[PDB]
Amino acid sequence: MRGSHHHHHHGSIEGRKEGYLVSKSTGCKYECLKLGDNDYCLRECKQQYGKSSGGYCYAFACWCTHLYEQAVVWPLPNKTCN
Secondary structure (H helix, E strand, O other): OEEEEEEEOOOOOOOOOOOOOOOOOOOOOOOOOOOOOOOHHHHHOOOOOOOOOOEEOOOOOEEOOOOOOOOOOOOOOOOOOO
């Protein structure tokens, strides 16, 4: 009846800032059809990162909020992923 002594933090790069839902598997992200007419941005940021993490259909593309430090985004202009 003891333990529960662990940690899930790697790096002192504090930020807790929003970011794309782009993963490492594929490596890309296509802007949804309508601007706020779907939940593809949330469902993608539900199991991936967490439940508390949400997201909407921003102007550019699926902009997720409340992301951890592990979350990875696609640092690129308004073009197709490399």
